[model samples]
Target: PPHGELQYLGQIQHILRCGVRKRTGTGTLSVFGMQARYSLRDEFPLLTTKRVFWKGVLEELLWFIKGSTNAKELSSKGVKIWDANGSRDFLDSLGFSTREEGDLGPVYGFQWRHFGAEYRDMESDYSGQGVDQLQKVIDTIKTNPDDRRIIMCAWNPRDLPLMALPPCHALCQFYVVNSELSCQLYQRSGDMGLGVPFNIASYALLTYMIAHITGLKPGDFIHTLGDAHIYLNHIEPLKIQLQREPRPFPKLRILRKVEKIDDFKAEDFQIEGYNPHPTIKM
Candidate 1:
């Protein structure tokens, strides 16, 4: 059985057994301050209990890396994860009445690559506009491996009013020890059934990419959540998921010797030996 999947399974069980019942978003079973650790030693952390949308994961991460703030960019490429939030109705509902449709304000990529940059709608060219925190962190890992401040954060209080939706997996920090790259993500909130599994693989994939570029081995991914919850609608599906045993996780193989972090394309990543059960739709 896959240990990475087990870690997630155990957390869902924990939440169901002892979480507080609330009326948030139709309904919720929630617990505060949860943490799980997955080893990226010789295996990728993609969950084997359910089929994750690998293409969406890869494309979304790539979009974030490119510092793109347009949902149309991802939707045009067949990744519609951000379509709901970027819709005109949703933007107006969030009090962004003047903002154009398909513009997601300064969300993940904006904060990741161009934190503190002035926002001027989605279509505006923002090249060299803000502080490139992602590149600086990569450079720091290569030069000063012991630097304690190697971090990328998306929880910008100043930019919150401008965003279509606030970030959940808000901040991440990287650590290099014994020539291995490890990452810890601090998510402000998470949906256990749908979002958490994807978050696990996303951060793990990120660690792998950075390690590959910096010539270090992938180490571990530590995910710490502030508000971990199960949606009322997801309860039944999650129970079905819990009955299934986990299979061994696949290995991530990078096809090319990509030199720059920004240069990694979707085709560069390949998951080997992924034999997961049928996807449990939420």
Candidate 2:
């Protein structure tokens, strides 16, 4: 059976259970989820059960980091997570009655690709490529451990006006010690039941890739979530998951040695030793 570090999930479950029942109004409901940091060397850091679509998650994350405003390329690859929203025109969902440009807001892709002219030069910036950024940070940590600018941010407040949906898993930073690179991701909002699992795996894999590129060992992946909440409708399903003891984490294998960030594919990521119950719908 697959295994995992259940302590983290267990702690989160307890927090949500208590917080949800005690809070009132939408605000209370909005502010509930767990934030934790862990070492990837000790664990692979993916949820063992409840099948997580690792490949799709990875591809989508890479695509977002690439600063893609359109979802046509992703949809062509069978990654439909963002396709519907792209076609619907994000402004419509926000109840805004206009098709005016720059009215949607700053989403993940926008912030990553164009980190605002005030913060960075979009023309010279190369952080959009995940593998490149990972490698660069790892090299920096190994060569220059005291640089304060070693950070990768995916959230830009300025782009909020043009984004359909604001970026939730917002900012991330990394630290290095003894040739090992560790990451800390600060997410402003988390959909615990539906989104947390994917976030964990995506960032963990990112850590591993960086580690591999820089000739350093993979270190910890600290996940600090701000407003983590389970939907009102997901309680019953969570109870079921809680009843089943967590299994060991599986091993994740990246099939190819991808030099550039764009070389990654769904076939490159493989997961073995995962054994979990049926996925509960949100």
Candidate 3:
């Protein structure tokens, strides 16, 4: 049962066939409420059912901490996750001409760093505007762990249209109890097959990073989703996944001491004993 991230994950899958079909020609079993929890004592929640590109997850997490909005930076880090969403055609369709090609306006980093700034263009500098929520969260977490407001949120309605894709993992709030740090994410939409696994790793790794730097023991990563669903086309991969048993969960190793959140590189994270099944194409 230790390797049963599948059990909880499969619980979401069970609702798939009975889910309502959408006007977008997709079958999505819209659920009202659901919760998935992972303990971060010794093992990280790297889904052993498939090999997760944890490096990309780390890079993206670091990018959010760095407060960057450019997809070129992530591209330099060998992650092409935003490539399809931030494509030139898509940008042009959204009335972006002078704006940079890879610039995903105010999605994660921008919203995390600058909450409510008037987003003119990704080319324009906006260091002076908006409330820096990440810094506040970090400062509060360090100074007063007992403070009831150590929450990091990335959903800004004013800046939604500026972004190539609105934040799906909308907000994550941290809690400290008995020297242990816990985090819960409220995601708007989750593509259960391809995206949720990465989301789990990303936020769990984030909770670990926050705890490591802030002098707290890692606790649990509680993930809650709003509109959790798999696409109509993802049934093949779903078939492959349902048939296989889950392997043991792997652990995330931080090679060096992380002085600051921004000081972490992808190399700082190393996955140990990650044996997984073959890839399932979604």
Candidate 4:
């Protein structure tokens, strides 16, 4: 059940501050090695406690699918999620863009589309330079469904210095058990308050899209996190959330037939009956 996810993250809310302190004055109530799964057939796995921006989630996934590194590309599409992580000054250190622009170096999209390629800068060309793991994920599922090693990864240690923000959802392994497509994501660092909720829905949308085009039904989306945490300041918001009952999960429908992954657009998605308490900002 998708409510399993609420309980999964919800229980961690009650536990004491077990992990170390961050750079900020506030501390985190954290734990390590927590595992949870949410099924697409049951619900969309959006946190019913808070109103999730479903359209933004789809756009961000599309951005990753298109293999973008420049923050301008995402911002142009009305998604400013990555703008906070992107540093104008950081992009200038190299001969890349100047200190006034946002060039996210070899982050998730670049790694997914072109692993092991040298990302010189945003404007520089990156065609035929690296291995495309995104295509690999689709091809492997279609060709070799039984293969145990079908994976899409974003962590590249070599490209760390070049990144605006290093990979958080570092590894994703796709599994085909009973001919159904399921995915497991290993997030190196899950910002419990601000990030985990978004990560949950984003990856699930990806799994749904991939599974639909690949002739398979969507299965469980397993999330495995590293350094799972909730901020000290986020206590009141979370307490308000936990007190509220978990509303029924909404279902997302793909309005059009998708021939290929890239052929699909964000407008093609339609979410049904998405009733929520209210939008919560931490």
Best prediction by TM-score: 1
> Residue 38's C-alpha lDDT in candidate 2?
62
In order of TM-score, best first, we have 1, 3, 4, 2
Off by over 4 Å in 4: 14-22, 90-100
Q: After superposition, how far is residue 236 of candidate 4 from its true place, in Å?
A: 1.5
Top model number, lDDT: 1
Give Cα-based local distance difference scores for all models: 0.90, 0.65, 0.80, 0.79
**lDDT by residue (tens digit), candidate 4, 1-282:** 236557655555644435655554577777777777888874688887777767678888888888887787887888887787566555565545644476787888789888998877767777788988988889999999988889887888898876766788889999887768899999888877777878889999988899988989889899998778878787778777777778778888888888788998978888888888876667
Which candidate order results from sorting by lDDT in descending order?
A: 1, 3, 4, 2
TM-score: the better of candidates 2 and 3: 3
TM-scores for all candidates?
0.96, 0.79, 0.93, 0.92
Q: How accurate is candidate 1 locally (lDDT)?
A: 0.90
> Please, what are the lDDT tens digits per residue for candidate 3 over residues 23-81?
45566556656778888888899887767778788888898887778888887888988
lDDT of model 1 at position 159: 95
Q: lDDT: which is higher, 1 or 2? A: 1
Deviation in Å, model 2, residue 242 alpha carbon: 0.3
Q: Compose the digit string of candidate 2's lDDT tens values, residues 1-282.
A: 223457556655665656654223433244544568666774577775566777677787777656555566566777777665555455476664444433223456555545554332222344443333434565576677767667877665665655566677777887778777788888888776778888888888877776666566778788888877766676667767777666777777778786655456667777777675677665
Task: Report the number of backbone clashes for model 4.
Answer: 0
